[PDB]
Design an enzyme around this catalytic site. Structure first.
Site, PDB file in Angstrom:
ATOM      1  N   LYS A 153       0.877  -0.859   0.188  1.00 42.78           N
ATOM      2  CA  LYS A 153       0.468   0.400  -0.028  1.00 42.78           C
ATOM      3  C   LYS A 153       1.168   1.572   0.132  1.00 42.78           C
ATOM      4  CE  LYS A 153      -4.071  -1.175   2.692  1.00 42.78           C
ATOM      5  NZ  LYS A 153      -4.715  -1.418   1.455  1.00 42.78           N
TER       6      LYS A 153
HETATM    7  C1  LIG Z   1      -6.534  -1.676   0.477  1.00 36.30           C
HETATM    8  C2  LIG Z   1      -6.720  -2.496  -0.398  1.00 36.30           C
HETATM    9  C3  LIG Z   1      -7.465  -3.022  -0.861  1.00 36.30           C
HETATM   10  C4  LIG Z   1      -8.169  -3.786   0.031  1.00 36.30           C
HETATM   11  O1  LIG Z   1      -7.480  -4.865   1.595  1.00 36.30           O
HETATM   12  P1  LIG Z   1      -7.768  -5.279   2.315  1.00 36.30           P
HETATM   13  O2  LIG Z   1      -6.642  -5.747   3.344  1.00 36.30           O
HETATM   14  O3  LIG Z   1      -9.191  -6.751   1.988  1.00 36.30           O
HETATM   15  O4  LIG Z   1      -7.996  -4.321   3.495  1.00 36.30           O
HETATM   16  C5  LIG Z   1      -7.324  -3.251  -2.555  1.00 36.30           C
HETATM   17  N1  LIG Z   1      -6.472  -2.859  -3.028  1.00 36.30           N
HETATM   18  C6  LIG Z   1      -5.969  -1.777  -2.882  1.00 36.30           C
HETATM   19  C7  LIG Z   1      -5.283  -1.429  -3.561  1.00 36.30           C
HETATM   20  C8  LIG Z   1      -5.912  -1.873  -1.585  1.00 36.30           C
HETATM   21  O5  LIG Z   1      -4.848  -0.373  -1.322  1.00 36.30           O
END
Ligand SMILES: *Cc1c(COP(=O)(O)O)cnc(C)c1O
Ligand SMILES: *Cc1c(COP(=O)(O)O)cnc(C)c1O
Ligand SMILES: *Cc1c(COP(=O)(O)O)cnc(C)c1O
Ligand SMILES: *Cc1c(COP(=O)(O)O)cnc(C)c1O
Ligand SMILES: *Cc1c(COP(=O)(O)O)cnc(C)c1O
Ligand SMILES: *Cc1c(COP(=O)(O)O)cnc(C)c1O
Ligand SMILES: NCC1(CC(=O)O)CCCCC1
Ligand SMILES: NCC1(CC(=O)O)CCCCC1
Ligand SMILES: NCC1(CC(=O)O)CCCCC1
Ligand SMILES: NCC1(CC(=O)O)CCCCC1
Ligand SMILES: NCC1(CC(=O)O)CCCCC1
Ligand SMILES: NCC1(CC(=O)O)CCCCC1
Lengths: 294, 297, 297, 294, 304, 304
Positions: free
Chosen positions: B150
């Site tokens: 992220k």
């Molecule tokens: C945060 C995010 C998700 C969701 O992931 P979770 O761990 O289930 O919160 C999905 N795709 C992207 C691009 C993200 O940044």
């Protein structure tokens, strides 16, 4: 960083006061745009190089993000000139920046308009390159014609890689395997008297690249624009890169393979020198590119 | 504005108004930051943070991708996250941890800026189904942007796709990879159901969702057959159901894609059951999933 | 077998039967060799080698790509090439210089094997037009194999395409790049003519042909407009003419591709003029192109 | 290289006599195929590991090139056993090789059939990897399921790159940006107790990879086969690679980013150790993979 | 569609008789080729724009499919002139079409040769006024990429190709735009669902490279016109954001003529309305096709 | 083609009347969808193989083009049963087709809804004998790649798609092969011009992933059959050389049934003839479609 007085959304304030909410959209999602503008000392004082062209790109980058800049171009230009004067700068690097604030943190930036803006500045063998294992983003993945904050995660990764490998800069290829550009420099190569500028492809349309091509042509060199592969550079007589901060930088080696003689070549060195003469006001023919602050 | 209240700034809490950083911060210029999305839900026994450790682990993993140094041990960050809920008296909230490269230098190389600055903030927090539109922006290839982390810069791609979908009259964007296959939403992992089987899309260039992981475990416990596959847009068009998962998105049914109704054209039974069991799990109503909760009080 | 006669082996000539190398040679196992194709044509003033310096320069450039060290100065290699013609009493012949990694080690890394072994051998050496078939093998991307160098390993790709075309009843293979655009023949640069304009294909992933360079110069001297462009298979299908260039291939008209006739279905006038002027140039019958010839005697 | 007696198209001869025309098609166009087979010393003497499986791939590689091998599999196997005995080898690396001769030098190899063959052999912290700027060839560019000579120009380029950068081995991605394999090793990674073997994609179908998966499963580990990205490896608990010469090699760092603890992990070390026990005849369960020469 | 008399394999017949078997290969597998030709009324009668160039392409498209057209180019040209005369048309759109018949239904179309051919023509119901032209067309980049050069023959007007154009066009319309802008699989700008693209920047006119697009005749015409007027024209590959920041953007096509683009992906182009260059090019182009430009009469074929 | 009585939008008519305007959108832009269904004769009359699954796909293909089929699935199923009965057919090939009509000729097909629909059926002229089956089919890898998932809808049987299949098939035939093997744009094996691929290696049966291929019903049937017989079936992505070294290779399709592949690109597969696995699967598959397998009667719909 010794920036001094920074223009913050309309008014100058001490560096220490130039801060923004850690909940700013841009700080979380890379939704900002910036420019790189240089001021060089001339016999008539500081002169900003191709100011309007840089400001135009600034607003163009913003349009790509559908970001709204709450100031008219003329005001930004005046802010840029003033960031030089007020700080008593002679030769400096100017960094205008527009970013989405902390109104909301949904990934969609539109709700955060208008963007906050600021302008900061600070006094200002041959490069060895290594081809990155990171490709420059396709034209439908990241806006490669705009200096958008998020784009530079790609440049940052390539740069660290190159340095860690013992080189000065990274050369990135596009996803198809063709040469793109450096982590932040446009590429050129010379072969049999001909200067080859790489096509824009997914690269930024460099202003230094533009200036260099004009200068090269004015000097009488033949200049062609083409798509290139790494081995076309490996066997070139010379290779060099351009950029505001990098100016005209000769490349003496790529992937541990020497370029030509293995040291800065005559063409690149000459273009660089004439470029420095242009930016310091020693060439009447290029006076139009200068904006004297004083 | 955002009503976060007290924010944890590099070791100590301060009023939101004081939670600010230099405009010369590397991350503000080059997207060099990493973040997480963590939720706390109200339960009969007080607020509970869903899978806190998995989120913190990914937070550090994202930092490693950028070779970013987080000057705090995981235990300290976890405590700061629990405290951001308490100190603000939240019962149900979205928690946003963020680490970014500061203002030591502005060369594209971030290393000279280590260690990273860190902060944790938080703010209090189906039937018809979501409408999606396939974006004209492809999710970045695995060697262009680190899609498993992220990383702040990554979201310029997400932002572009999201604005596009909303502008076109849809709720969310569905992105394809450069090869043309379905990747994921602007910020949600995708699933689809056909002939009783639940299909979870492969990780490919997508983020390895924690909600995705949860829904798969739940689905298998309920007795559904789950397959992990690569998918094309038209495989979704003819699916019985399609749904999205994410910490913020939870489990969201998708009733239409590119103006083509999915199945009956409304939220399907499978997505709804998965959603229901998930909300029961995060609210402490499923003993078998208690290990996923971290009670704040 | 091949009637080469005396072969130059690392500094001295020896009978062909003695021109052998260890089966443990790195290049025999990993394709780590580089080569050139140079021709000598008979002229009223004796044999003349066509553009010897450009060929030798590329020979060294190819070596640089593999980081291969050629333990001889260009001048020595050029002399060995002139002598291979003399000593064998050739008037018209194909000259094949070759540098390969020896048998010091068999790890995939070739560096421990430097310097390279080197040898130069040579052997004595349209109307209807050639028939081509588009290969099911794509020429390697610019970051997969060094397509600007004549590296031994590269020709596995060429060999596969050539066998395929011949098996299908064609004379030569036309390869596309991975993106689907026309690249080049198994060993020939491509050109096409439409509405009086001559189109030379961009270098893309192809080798920068010396014959290609020659034909372009000639074409411009004759007054033809020449453009360098990227091309698709169907742009060739509807061209007035299509032809190939190479040292061995010289200038070869292409009358059919994928069983689709090109223009009139026979060699066209433009390709024929270019071919005629080229053969005049290499045989010393064009004063303006004398700089390209190196007389052996 | 200390090879000693080499089997040359039917008969053994001193190394010095094992030579071929410099006009051999393979020497100019990479038209050859080879194998990598190891013999390990056991309490019952030298034992060749998975001999028949290696010979089968040898002939399979030849079919891809439409190369004709003028010997029956049984004869090659006998030659392989004899190259060990005659040279008095205990633990060695065996290299069978089939290449196109010097009948003609047109790029088309068919006219050169049948291929010439030979068999040579010679006594036999955690690896640090760097991701290559060279991608492993697409499945329609070079035959990635075959050990064809020309293919290794790609491996050679990646290997030199890695070493020059200060690493031990290169990790190549495919043209789409996904992890492929090392310059000559198949890849694996471990995460939360699960062992992930990468799909075959454009990689060679490793016999060591196969053995490792069987062993892992026999030991009770859960094993999955998937497509992977570089950052999936960056965050794995462990990463390791396999190959005949490389055996099972743990990877403690990739692109200067430590994997897990930053040193060889327990899973990879265990698989490696059990693998060595299997190849040295200490595991009855794997005796079927051994061919005792004496 | 009110076509009236339609040329069917050598003879004109009422529209009602201009039908073909529902077992025709082309109706099942997209195995057809067509052209778009226009006749513009002049004070000397209807004039067909670049007829031979369009006819050459019709045959070129057929060669791609290895489709055999059982008529000499001259016969087709006569048919095209007559469809206009026999229906008493002045200005009109002409649609030649060659399709594989119903001999057999295996994917291989060769057993179905020779192809059937027809030429129909009909009048326009309405035209865009200058106000609409000035407002400009609004584009949206499609989520469908134009086919790579080794997937579908992009230089040929082959029926099957237009499934791609159809998908993109519907997408653009549903999104609230006027036309779709397709990118190639690599992410670069290709063309509209059926229009070639151009953009202007700092005084220079940029025509996009042919890449996987059709080599438009209107595109060719516009380039010639632009140069004759003294403009500098360059041919380049372009990205979506190079268009976002262009001074002007416009598209060409027989039906689209020269159409100014005022917005792409909700981002205004230049001033947000048609620019002076595109409008000037459109005007001269129209003067050319309507026989008011002596220097371009060579491009016209008068039916009478 | 001798189809006889053809169902045309709700009513049967003689073949001669089963025609459509040459101005129909689908004849110009490939905007049609179709199915391939077979009826196999049994001692209890003709039995249609997996009718509802084929009908569901017909409608699914229509949804991709946003094409409206003005008939309930049940009506179509009745039409399909009747085309067999009314023509007195026993074994026969059934071809349902829905195409955009002649309302307008802009690329956008929406203005042409609802689509026209027809169901035709005809008998086979000949069948491959066991000798030919045993020799096996010879394939050649095509120089045309199957369209990426964002270029043409590969999961739908859309007419325009088959221009790609046609080009590859002609190429294979001209090369001297029986069928073409297409790779995707990335270089991996996709499928035949109209057949799904399988390969067998060291006792395991490998079905190729769906990637950009059509999700074949014969493919699905073969997988179920293989597992019921005790074979291990794996689904994987494959390269051309994985097939070159496979023990056996075979393809599936409604028309192709289960066809052994004995050679690819002039390289023999395994023994160079059909292998025991493919032949065994073909036999059981045929026993299933001809109503001789009680466990598979659920897949059959008896017309009488
Ligand atoms: C945060 C995010 C998700 C969701 O992931 P979770 O761990 O289930 O919160 C999905 N795709 C992207 C691009 C993200 O940044
Ligand atoms: C800023 C930048 C350049 C240089 O452009 P100049 O206008 O010459 O300063 C080159 N590449 C990238 C990626 C850049 O961000
Ligand atoms: C040698 C070669 C050519 C021809 O180049 P010339 O310099 O004109 O001989 C073209 N393509 C390939 C792949 C080659 O190896
Ligand atoms: C030989 C080889 C391997 C290893 O395969 P093993 O059968 O395990 O020896 C892996 N990758 C490549 C490219 C190889 O050539
Ligand atoms: C017909 C067409 C055009 C326009 O070409 P003109 O020759 O100018 O009519 C552009 N793109 C496509 C895809 C077309 O079919
Ligand atoms: C119809 C078709 C098949 C075969 O599918 P079945 O449902 O088994 O008839 C395979 N590939 C393509 C491209 C097809 O159109
Ligand atoms: N090399 C530097 C820059 C370009 C330049 O001005 O040369 C790009 C990365 C961000 C800082 C600027
Ligand atoms: N849809 C939202 C998130 C994911 C989520 O938690 O569903 C991604 C973009 C950044 C905010 C979070
Ligand atoms: N067609 C032949 C060559 C090129 C040439 O000289 O035309 C390439 C393959 C290797 C032999 C030479
Ligand atoms: N790392 C080595 C090999 C593989 C192996 O056996 O590990 C590949 C390159 C060629 C030599 C063999
Ligand atoms: N927009 C229309 C055309 C082009 C044109 O004439 O602008 C392309 C699709 C087929 C009909 C013609
Ligand atoms: N080979 C034929 C089909 C498939 C089949 O039934 O094998 C695909 C093209 C359209 C007709 C059907």
């Amino acid at each position: 960083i010794k920036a001094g007085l920074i223009w913050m959304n309309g008014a100058f304030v001490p560096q220490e006061e130039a801060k923004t909410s850690v909940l700013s959209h841009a700080l979380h999602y890379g939704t900002s745009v910036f420019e790189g503008i240089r001021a060089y000392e001339t016999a008539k004082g500081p002169a900003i190089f191709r100011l309007k062209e840089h400001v135009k790109r600034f607003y163009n980058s913003a349009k790509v993000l559908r970001m709204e800049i709450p100031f008219a171009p003329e005001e930004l230009e005046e802010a840029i000139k003033e960031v030089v004067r007020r700080n008593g700068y002679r030769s400096c690097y100017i960094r205008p920046l527009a970013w989405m604030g902390a109104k909301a943190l949904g990934v969609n930036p539109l709700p955060n308009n208008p963007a906050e803006v600021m302008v900061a500045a600070w006094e200002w063998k041959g490069a060895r390159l290594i081809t990155s294992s990171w490709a420059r983003f396709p034209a439908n993945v990241m806006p490669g014609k705009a200096k958008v904050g998020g784009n530079y995660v790609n440049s940052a990764l390539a740069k660290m890689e190159a340095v860690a490998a013992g080189a000065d800069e990274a050369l990135l290829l596009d996803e198809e395997g063709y040469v793109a550009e450096g982590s932040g420099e446009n590429l050129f190569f010379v072969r049999d008297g001909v200067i080859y500028a790489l096509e824009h492809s997914v690269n930024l349309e460099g202003i230094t690249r533009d200036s260099v091509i004009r200068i090269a042509k004015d000097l009488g060199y033949e200049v062609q624009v083409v798509r290139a592969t790494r081995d076309q550079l490996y066997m070139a007589d010379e290779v060099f890169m351009t950029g505001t901060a990098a100016e005209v930088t000769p490349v003496s080696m790529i992937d541990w393979r020497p370029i030509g003689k293995g040291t800065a070549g005559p063409v690149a060195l000459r273009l660089r020198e004439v470029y420095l003469e242009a930016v310091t006001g020693r060439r009447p023919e290029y006076e139009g590119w200068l904006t004297y602050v004083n």
